[PDB]
C-alpha cells in the first residue's frame, strides 16, 4: 500500500517506471546479449535478443 501522485512522488513514480522497463531490456544489449522469452498467451513462444 503506497500512494504516490504528488509532484516529487510523481517524478519518483515516473523514474521507477522507467527503471523497470529498462530492466525489461537490460540484458539484451550487445551482440552476445541474453535472450528473453515471452509468449503471446496462447502458446506462441518467442525467444528474442532484439
Amino acid at each position: 500500500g503506497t500512494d504516490s501522485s504528488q509532484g516529487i512522488p510523481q517524478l519518483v513514480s515516473n523514474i521507477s517506471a522507467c527503471q523497470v522497463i529498462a530492466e525489461a531490456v537490460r540484458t539484451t544489449l550487445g551482440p552476445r546479449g541474453m535472450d528473453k522469452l515471452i509468449v503471446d498467451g496462447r502458446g506462441k513462444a518467442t525467444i528474442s535478443n532484439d
Binding site: 541474453m34 535472450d35 528473453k36 522469452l37 515471452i38 513462444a45 525467444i47
Partner: protein, 503 residues
C-alpha cells in the same frame, strides 16, 4: 508483493526442467521402467520410447515446452534415445546450477559446455572403433536389431523379426542416397495375430471390401484401375440409363484406356460389377483415398487415380503371387500382390499387441536411421554408457591443460555425462555409483573403451560380445543437440509471461 527475476529465475527454471528430466531419467535403457500414457479423454496405453512420452504429455512451464519442442526436432534426426537428451539436459543444468553457486556467469557456463562438447565429439571420433564395412553385414545385422528388441520376448522371434529388419533395410537400400522417404513407409500392422505371422510380405493388404463378396479373387493381370470417379421411375430410370451409360462409357473408356480393376472410392451398384464378373473382370466399390502410391509402387508406378492417365505402363500395380487368408475371422482383404517389386516397400506385421506394433514401426524406423548410419556414415560406437565414460575421462583430461575459469564447466560437463551410465545402472536395479566408478576404474586400468554397464545382465561389462551398438551420428547428434539446448536454456533468463498480470 512478489516478482521472480534475476539469477533466481535461472534457479527456478532448472529445477523445473530437470524435474521433467527426473520423470524421464527412469526410462533410460532397455531395462528402463517403461511407462503408461493416459489421455484427458480416458484412453490408456504403455510406451517405453521417451519421445512419445514427452510429446503426448502436456506440460505447464514454458521451459518444458521448449524442451519438448526441441526434442521433437531431434526425432527426425535420430528418434532413438531422445530420452537421453532430456537426461543430459537435466544433468548439465544441475551442474550449471552448481557452477552458478560459485558465481560463474551462465554465458561462460554455456560456451564452456560448448568447448567441452568440442572435446566430446572429437574424442568420440577418437574412440570410434567402428566397423565401416557394414554394408553386406547380414550376419551382424542380427545383433544390430537384437538390442533394439532386447526388452521383450521379441528376441525369441528375432529369427523372424530381425531378419524382417535386415530384408527391410536391404529392400530400401538406395546405395547412393541412403534414405527412407515419405513413400517408403514400412508398416502394415494387423492388430491380432501372433509372433511369426509378423512376416515377409512386400505388398498391399488394406481392409477394403471386395468387388463381389463371392468373387474369384485371382486377378493376376496388372490391368488394374484406381478411380477418381464418384457418383457425381424416370428419375431412377434416367439414373439407370446413366448407370448402364457409366458401364458402356466409363468401362468402355477403360477399354480404350486400360483401367480394369475399377476400385471406385464412392457410390456404385454392384450388379454392373456383377455383369463385369460375368465378363470376368473385377471392380471394387468405396475404396480408400491415399493408398494409391503404396498400391502403385508394387511394380514401380506412381499415383494414378485419373480416368485417362492410367495407361498400360502406369496401371494399378501388384507385387507377388500369393494367396493367404487375410481375414481369417475378418473379411479377407485385397490381394494387391501379383507382379513385380515394390520400392516404396511395406511389410506384413500381425502383432496383436499395441506395444509390439509401436516398437516394430518406430524401432524399424530407428533401424532405418542407424542402418542408414551403416550406409550414410557407417560409424558405430559401443554404447551402454561406455561411450559416456570414455568421453567423460577425456573431457576431464582436457579440463587440465586449459587456463581459464571455463575449465570448471568441463569438469561440470563430464560428470553430467555420468548420469547416462548411472541411469542405465539405476534402472537395471544395481548400485548406480559403484558400478559406474568400477567400470571407470576398469577403463583407466584397461584401455578398451567398450567396457560399459551390464544392462542385459549377461556375462561381463564388455559391449563387444553383447553388441550394445549405437551409431556415431546418433551419439554426436545426441550430445550436440543436448549442448545446443542447454545453451538455449542458459541464455534465457526472464520469462515475462503474457496475460499473467504483473502487478
Amino acid at each position: 508483493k512478489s516478482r521472480l527475476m534475476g539469477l533466481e529465475a535461472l534457479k527456478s527454471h532448472i529445477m523445473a526442467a530437470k524435474a521433467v528430466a527426473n520423470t524421464m531419467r527412469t526410462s533410460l535403457g532397455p531395462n528402463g521402467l517403461d511407462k503408461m500414457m493416459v489421455d484427458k479423454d480416458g484412453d490408456v496405453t504403455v510406451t517405453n520410447d521417451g519421445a512419445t512420452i514427452l510429446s503426448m504429455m502436456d506440460v505447464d512451464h514454458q521451459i518444458a515446452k521448449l524442451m519438448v519442442e526441441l526434442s521433437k526436432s531431434q526425432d527426425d534426426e535420430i528418434g532413438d534415445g531422445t530420452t537421453g537428451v532430456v537426461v543430459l539436459a537435466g544433468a548439465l543444468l544441475e551442474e550449471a546450477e552448481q557452477l552458478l553457486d560459485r558465481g560463474i556467469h551462465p554465458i561462460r557456463i554455456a560456451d564452456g559446455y560448448e568447448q567441452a562438447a568440442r572435446v566430446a565429439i572429437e574424442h568420440l571420433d577418437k574412440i570410434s572403433d567402428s566397423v565401416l564395412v557394414d554394408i553386406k553385414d547380414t550376419e551382424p545385422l542380427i545383433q544390430t536389431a537384437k538390442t533394439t528388441l532386447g526388452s521383450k520376448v521379441v528376441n525369441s522371434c528375432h529369427r523372424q523379426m530381425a531378419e524382417i529388419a535386415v530384408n527391410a533395410v536391404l529392400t530400401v537400400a538406395d546405395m547412393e542416397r541412403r534414405d527412407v522417404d515419405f513413400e517408403l513407409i514400412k508398416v502394415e500392422g494387423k492388430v491380432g495375430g501372433r509372433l511369426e505371422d509378423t512376416k515377409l510380405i512386400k505388398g498391399v493388404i488394406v481392409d477394403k471390401d471386395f468387388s463381389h463378396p463371392q468373387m474369384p479373387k485371382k486377378v493376376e493381370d496388372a490391368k488394374i484401375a484406381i478411380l477418381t470417379c464418384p457418383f457425381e421411375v424416370e428419375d431412377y430410370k434416367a439414373l439407370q440409363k446413366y448407370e448402364k451409360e457409366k458401364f458402356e462409357e466409363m468401362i468402355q473408356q477403360i477399354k480404350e484406356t486400360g483401367a480394369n480393376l475399377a476400385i471406385c472410392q464412392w457410390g456404385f451398384d454392384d450388379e454392373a460389377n456383377h455383369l463385369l464378373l460375368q465378363n470376368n473382370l473385377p471392380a471394387v466399390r468405396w475404396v480408400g483415398g491415399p493408398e494409391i502410391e503404396l498400391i502403385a509402387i508394387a511394380t514401380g508406378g506412381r499415383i494414378v487415380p485419373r480416368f485417362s492417365e492410367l495407361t498400360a505402363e502406369k496401371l494399378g500395380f501388384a507385387g507377388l503371387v500369393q494367396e493367404i487368408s487375410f481375414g481369417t475371422t475378418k473379411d479377407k482383404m485385397l490381394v494387391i500382390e501379383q507382379c513385380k517389386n515394390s520400392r516404396a516397400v511395406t511389410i506384413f506385421i500381425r502383432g496383436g499387441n499395441k506395444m509390439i506394433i509401436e516398437e516394430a514401426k518406430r524401432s524399424l524406423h530407428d533401424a532405418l536411421c542407424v542402418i542408414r548410419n551403416l550406409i550414410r556414415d557407417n560409424r558405430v560406437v559401443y554404447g551402454g554408457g561406455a561411450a559416456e565414460i570414455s568421453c567423460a575421462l577425456a573431457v576431464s583430461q582436457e579440463a587440465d591443460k586449459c587456463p581459464t575459469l571455463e575449465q570448471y564447466a568441463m569438469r561440470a560437463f563430464a560428470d553430467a555425462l555420468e548420469v547416462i551410465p548411472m541411469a542405465l545402472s539405476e534402472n537395471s536395479g544395481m548400485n548406480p555409483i559403484q558400478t559406474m566408478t568400477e567400470v571407470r576404474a576398469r577403463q583407466v586400468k584397461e584401455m578398451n573403451p567398450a567396457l560399459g554397464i551390464d544392462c542385459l545382465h549377461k556375462g561381463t561389462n564388455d559391449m563387444k560380445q553383447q553388441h550394445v551398438i549405437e551409431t556415431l551420428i546418433g551419439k554426436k547428434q545426441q550430445i550436440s543437440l543436448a549442448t545446443q539446448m542447454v545453451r538455449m536454456i542458459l541464455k534465457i533468463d526472464d520469462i515475462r509471461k503474457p496475460g499473467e498480470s504483473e502487478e
